[PDB]
């Protein structure tokens, strides 16, 4: 199904992709969030972290 912009109430999708060779952002059923940058206005509560700087 190919569509233009769409407005929704609640979506239930296991795989979400930005489209592309190496998608800019992706979400997979194994809980993975892949992105290029993450701007969060509040708190990031994580069990582990691995940052270069």
């Amino acid at each position: 199904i190919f569509m233009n912009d769409v407005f929704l109430k609640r979506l239930t999708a296991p795989t979400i992709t930005s489209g592309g060779n190496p998608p800019a952002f992706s979400l997979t059923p194994d809980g993975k969030l892949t992105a290029k940058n993450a701007d969060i206005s509040g708190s990031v509560n994580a069990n582990s972290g691995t940052l270069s700087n």
């Binding site: 582990s48 972290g49 691995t50 940052l51 270069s52 700087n53």
Partner: protein, 52 residues
């Protein structure tokens, strides 16, 4: 947290244990044995360093 490169805190760092290249230091005075009005150092001091 595992940081593979520089980490820069611009405020106050409150750490319990530091395992960096800081100095550790301990110090004591020998026990003093005395008679009448004069004392002299005589005794043992034991310093333990843990391999942590």
């Amino acid at each position: 947290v595992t940081i593979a490169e520089n980490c820069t805190i611009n405020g106050t760092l409150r750490a319990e244990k530091i395992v960096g290249d800081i100095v550790k230091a301990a110090s004591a005075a020998f026990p003093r044995q005395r008679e009448s009005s004069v004392d002299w150092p005589s005794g043992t001091r034991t310093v333990t360093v843990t391999d942590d």
